[PDB]
Structure formats: structure tokens, C-alpha cells
Design a protein around this ligand. Structure first.
Ligand SMILES: [Ca+2]
Ligand SMILES: [Ca+2]
Ligand SMILES: [Ca+2]
Ligand SMILES: [Ca+2]
Ligand SMILES: [Ca+2]
Length: 319
């Protein structure tokens, strides 16, 4: 009945003892990576910030600086991601994605399509405080087409409240989305962007259902997942996030590991950002939709302490 992550507050938390444990794991020429990853993956993000404070008070050193030099590679990147304050994670990920012509549209689409209006409001406020600019201005400056416009509408976080189902509106919206897809999402973009971006989640769930009966196929089938452009990818992420945010992010994890190579940036990002929100539900959708557990997939694609920390973040095997 509730969303649910895999990381919770550690019972009997003593930030000073945890700071000594992390310092003992790093003081000297050696490194106890096992002790570091066991402690940090079992402490909540808020507790990690308290350890960071006690670490500086007791020893006069910066914990994040110590971890960066003591650790290397993907394990270091995972630990650094876990130490970033939860209030700042998405805003930092978006600013990093908005890098000129090398803009990472996947990160923009992933965060902006799957975050709630309340989360997007906090992101916009934190983004301004950190980088001196507005997220909208940075988005408009680095994106184009109606992909930019759909990102702007979603960022406004003005989605209608979950209210009573209006059958006349569901029929009119499903008809319009069918005619927009017939034109390959290249005509009257403001029209379907307004439907995708400002209609309530429960309303759009019904619109997607009325779309199935009217057209004979689900609305996702009008967009090729691999070859489609940015707007169509964003539409696909919004539609899937409307159905189930954990299902969309589980599919995102799945394709980050399917095939050759591993999208470790996406693996780390989704694992960490959702660790205290809905990573458990993501695991449930992962097992249900891809016939294998998130745990077993991480075990087969990663290595070293990076794999150890990822599996502990995952929590447990499924099935
Ligand atoms: Ca050392
Ligand atoms: Ca040591
Ligand atoms: Ca390093
Ligand atoms: Ca937020
Ligand atoms: Ca891959």
C-alpha cells in the first residue's frame, strides 16, 4: 500500500562511532573497502551526512575527499553518489546532463518524467540555490524542438489533482492522442503535450485504456524504443511513468545492463536515487517484467567491491 526503498535508518545510530569506523578503514597505507561499503550501504543518506560532520569534527579531515583518494573506479563513483545529499542529487544530475552539445538527454528525460510534481518543485528550488540559474533556462538553452517544450511543461509541475473520472474527457483525450500518434507525433505538439503533461495520473491511466480499445494497440506501440527521437523517448518515459514509476525505472535498469557493455552511470543513478523511495517496488516490477531478479543481473554484470555495494543496495534476491 506504500512505496518503499531498500535503505532505512540504522538502529542505534552513533555518528561518532561510524566516523571512527570509517577512519579506521582508511588510516594508513591500507584500505578496508569491505568495512566502508558495509557501513555506508546500511546507513541512510541523512545518517551519512551526520557521519560526514562527525568525521570532520573528530579528525579535522573531509570524509568525501578521503573516500575519493582511497577508492577508485566504479566503486568510488558509487560511494560518492551515495554520499551526495538526497536533496541535491537530482539537481546535480540535471546540471551535469546540461552540458552543451554533449547534453545527456537520457538523464533529463529519466528524472523529469518520473519525478512527482512535489519532487520537481523541490528540485527547481535547489537547482537555483546551487548554480545561480533556473533549471528551465538551462533546459531551454540546451534542448530544442518540442522535446524542450515537453520538458518545460513537465517542469512546471502543474499536473491536475487526482479527482473524479470524467468519462467524456477520457474519450475526447484518447481520440486526440490516437490522431496525434497517427501523425507520428509531429503535428499539433502543444495539444498532446498538454494532455501528457497537465492531465492527472489517474485520468491518463484511463485515457491509455480507452486508447487500447479505440486503436487495438497500446499507446507505447506508436514509438520505437530504440530509433525514436528525443520527444518520442520522453513521451515513452512519461507514458510508462504514468502507468507505474517503479516499472519505468525498472525497465531503465534492465536496458542499462542488457546487451553488450554496462551503462554504469544509469545503474548507479537509479540504484542510489531510489534507494530510500521505491527501489523495493522497482525490484518487484523488475522480476515480474523481465523474468529475472535485479540482484542476479547485477551479480552477472559487475565486479569487485562495486558489485558488493550494489548487491547490498539491492537488499536481497527476488524469487
Ligand atoms: Ca589508506
Ligand atoms: Ca586499513
Ligand atoms: Ca580515486
Ligand atoms: Ca526533490
Ligand atoms: Ca547496456
Amino acid at each position: 500500500q506504500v512505496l518503499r526503498g531498500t535503505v532505512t535508518d540504522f538502529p542505534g545510530f552513533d555518528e561518532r562511532a561510524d566516523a571512527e569506523t570509517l577512519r579506521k578503514a582508511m588510516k594508513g597505507l591500507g584500505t578496508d573497502e569491505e568495512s566502508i561499503l558495509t557501513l555506508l550501504t546500511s546507513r541512510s543518506n541523512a545518517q551519512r551526512q551526520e557521519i560526514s560532520a562527525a568525521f570532520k569534527t573528530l579528525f579535522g579531515r573531509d570524509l568525501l575527499d578521503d573516500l575519493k583518494s582511497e577508492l577508485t573506479g566504479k566503486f568510488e563513483k558509487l560511494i560518492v553518489a551515495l554520499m551526495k545529499p538526497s536533496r541535491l542529487y537530482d539537481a546535480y544530475e540535471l546540471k551535469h546532463a546540461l552540458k552543451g552539445a554533449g547534453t545527456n538527454e537520457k538523464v533529463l528525460t529519466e528524472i523529469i518524467a518520473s519525478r512527482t510534481p512535489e519532487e520537481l518543485r523541490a528540485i527547481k528550488q535547489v537547482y537555483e540555490e546551487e548554480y545561480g540559474s533556473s533549471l528551465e533556462d538551462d533546459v531551454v538553452g540546451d534542448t530544442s524542438g518540442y522535446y524542450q517544450r515537453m520538458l518545460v511543461v513537465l517542469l512546471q509541475a502543474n499536473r491536475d489533482p487526482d479527482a473524479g473520472i470524467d468519462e467524456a474527457q477520457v474519450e475526447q483525450d484518447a481520440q486526440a492522442l490516437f490522431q496525434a500518434g497517427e501523425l507520428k507525433w509531429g503535428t499539433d505538439e502543444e495539444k498532446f503535450i498538454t494532455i501528457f503533461g497537465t492531465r492527472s495520473v489517474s485520468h491518463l491511466r484511463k485515457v491509455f485504456d480507452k486508447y487500447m480499445t479505440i486503436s487495438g494497440f497500446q499507446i507505447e506501440e506508436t514509438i520505437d524504443r530504440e530509433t525514436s527521437g528525443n520527444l518520442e523517448q520522453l513521451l515513452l518515459a512519461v507514458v510508462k511513468s504514468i502507468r507505474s514509476i517503479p516499472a519505468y525505472l525498472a525497465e531503465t535498469l534492465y536496458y542499462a545492463m542488457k546487451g553488450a557493455g554496462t551503462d554504469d552511470h544509469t545503474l548507479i543513478r537509479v540504484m542510489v536515487s531510489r534507494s530510500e523511495i521505491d527501489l523495493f517496488n522497482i525490484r518487484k516490477e523488475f522480476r515480474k517484467n523481465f523474468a529475472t531478479s535485479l540482484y542476479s543481473m547485477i551479480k552477472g554484470d559487475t565486479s569487485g567491491d562495486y558489485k558488493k555495494a550494489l548487491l547490498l543496495l539491492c537488499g536481497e534476491d527476488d524469487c
